[PDB]
Design an enzyme around this catalytic site. Sequence first.
Site, PDB file in Angstrom:
ATOM      1  N   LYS A 100     -27.322 -39.021 -10.630  1.00  0.00           N
ATOM      2  CA  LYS A 100     -26.937 -39.831  -9.480  1.00  0.00           C
ATOM      3  C   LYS A 100     -28.245 -40.033  -8.731  1.00  0.00           C
ATOM      4  O   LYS A 100     -28.844 -39.067  -8.273  1.00  0.00           O
ATOM      5  CB  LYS A 100     -25.917 -39.093  -8.602  1.00  0.00           C
ATOM      6  CG  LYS A 100     -25.495 -39.859  -7.340  1.00  0.00           C
ATOM      7  CD  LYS A 100     -24.401 -39.107  -6.584  1.00  0.00           C
ATOM      8  CE  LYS A 100     -23.954 -39.850  -5.325  1.00  0.00           C
ATOM      9  NZ  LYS A 100     -23.268 -41.143  -5.603  1.00  0.00           N
ATOM     10  N   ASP A 121     -24.762 -24.103  -6.044  1.00  0.00           N
ATOM     11  CA  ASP A 121     -25.677 -25.041  -6.701  1.00  0.00           C
ATOM     12  C   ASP A 121     -26.699 -24.193  -7.465  1.00  0.00           C
ATOM     13  O   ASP A 121     -27.275 -23.251  -6.907  1.00  0.00           O
ATOM     14  CB  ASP A 121     -26.427 -25.911  -5.675  1.00  0.00           C
ATOM     15  CG  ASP A 121     -25.530 -26.932  -4.985  1.00  0.00           C
ATOM     16  OD1 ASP A 121     -24.448 -27.265  -5.510  1.00  0.00           O
ATOM     17  OD2 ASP A 121     -25.926 -27.430  -3.916  1.00  0.00           O
ATOM     18  N   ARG A 156     -22.503 -38.042 -12.533  1.00  0.00           N
ATOM     19  CA  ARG A 156     -23.791 -37.686 -11.945  1.00  0.00           C
ATOM     20  C   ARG A 156     -24.839 -37.194 -12.948  1.00  0.00           C
ATOM     21  O   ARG A 156     -25.439 -36.139 -12.772  1.00  0.00           O
ATOM     22  CB  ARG A 156     -23.576 -36.653 -10.836  1.00  0.00           C
ATOM     23  CG  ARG A 156     -22.674 -37.148  -9.728  1.00  0.00           C
ATOM     24  CD  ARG A 156     -22.583 -36.146  -8.612  1.00  0.00           C
ATOM     25  NE  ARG A 156     -21.884 -36.674  -7.442  1.00  0.00           N
ATOM     26  CZ  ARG A 156     -21.617 -35.963  -6.351  1.00  0.00           C
ATOM     27  NH1 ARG A 156     -21.992 -34.692  -6.286  1.00  0.00           N
ATOM     28  NH2 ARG A 156     -21.011 -36.528  -5.313  1.00  0.00           N
ATOM     29  N   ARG A 186     -20.810 -26.254  -8.504  1.00  0.00           N
ATOM     30  CA  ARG A 186     -21.142 -27.613  -8.107  1.00  0.00           C
ATOM     31  C   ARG A 186     -22.371 -28.182  -8.860  1.00  0.00           C
ATOM     32  O   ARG A 186     -22.345 -28.259 -10.101  1.00  0.00           O
ATOM     33  CB  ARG A 186     -21.270 -27.706  -6.586  1.00  0.00           C
ATOM     34  CG  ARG A 186     -21.362 -29.129  -6.035  1.00  0.00           C
ATOM     35  CD  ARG A 186     -22.155 -29.085  -4.731  1.00  0.00           C
ATOM     36  NE  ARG A 186     -22.474 -30.402  -4.205  1.00  0.00           N
ATOM     37  CZ  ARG A 186     -23.618 -30.713  -3.604  1.00  0.00           C
ATOM     38  NH1 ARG A 186     -24.567 -29.799  -3.457  1.00  0.00           N
ATOM     39  NH2 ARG A 186     -23.786 -31.929  -3.086  1.00  0.00           N
TER      40      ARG A 186
END
Length: 359
Positions: free
Chosen positions: A239, A154, A236, A176
């Site tokens: 999201k 991330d 997303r 991700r």
Amino acid sequence: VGVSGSAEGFAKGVTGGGSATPVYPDTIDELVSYLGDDEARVIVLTKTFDFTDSEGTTTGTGCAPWGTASACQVAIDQDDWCENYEPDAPSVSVEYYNAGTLGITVTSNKSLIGEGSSGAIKGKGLRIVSGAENIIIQNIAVTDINPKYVWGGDAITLDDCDLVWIDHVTTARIGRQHYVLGTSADNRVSLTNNYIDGVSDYSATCDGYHYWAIYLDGDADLVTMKGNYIYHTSGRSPKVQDNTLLHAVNNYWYDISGHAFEIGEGGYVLAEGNVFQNVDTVLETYEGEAFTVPSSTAGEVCSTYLGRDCVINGFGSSGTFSEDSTSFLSDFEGKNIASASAYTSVASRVVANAGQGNL
């Protein structure tokens, strides 16, 4: 050099390292020590701080839920993810760098800035840890973090921190999430003028569109999104879940083969003055509530709460997002509200100002 401009929106008043004398880390170890020490600092990055190989490489086993073609993404089996959350089919051999797995710890009162288009971090992201507050991250790029593997990394993670301003940051080719927010009740965050580059060689949709963009999973947080450029994503974007109050103003979504908003139960969105260009589906899931200023007259209702009218969004070759729920407007009272320009100038000004190097 130092911090340019100031935060607009919920995190107005953030100071970061303040007037502290700038330190110019030389090695990756110095950068890590400066961001995590207990002292106010202005940290300048003048070169690319590569962490790709710093912690080695792991050979394990994961699954391929989104096809086994070269241009597809496969998942790393963390916490028996595959067999558990999705009784997979092909199990493949995965080889990833261990550094991207977890981001660099960031403590309170830090201003992390990059000079021109030189500042960058490769192979590892950032993590604003619990309890940390008053942080400015400006004009840097966080890229290349295990592109082909979900759970591979991330880019920017915030978890229970207050008064954070991420401005002019560019994120690209991340395994991700580019942004994951795990903030708590009343935590103020302003994400401005950022560039989310979703173009990647590996995607969970196999077409070159990044699905794991922005994830707002905080508790009762206040997030301002202004002037951001969301490009080439497939989901997303963003999201929104739990009880997050999101003020999305003057942002630009362009070329989204998939969808943008996923508004989960409890999420509140006030979307005004944004431009959606070539976005297949602007609103996918809608279990929360949103006010998208369907008309200029509808925007007049914002006057009592924001001190001014809300402004309409522009839609060009995109799906619709027309909701007029106003139940949550009083949650704006007494807070720092970001101003809004007409959407007519947004596409041009965002592409010109968003991201590292355009400060």
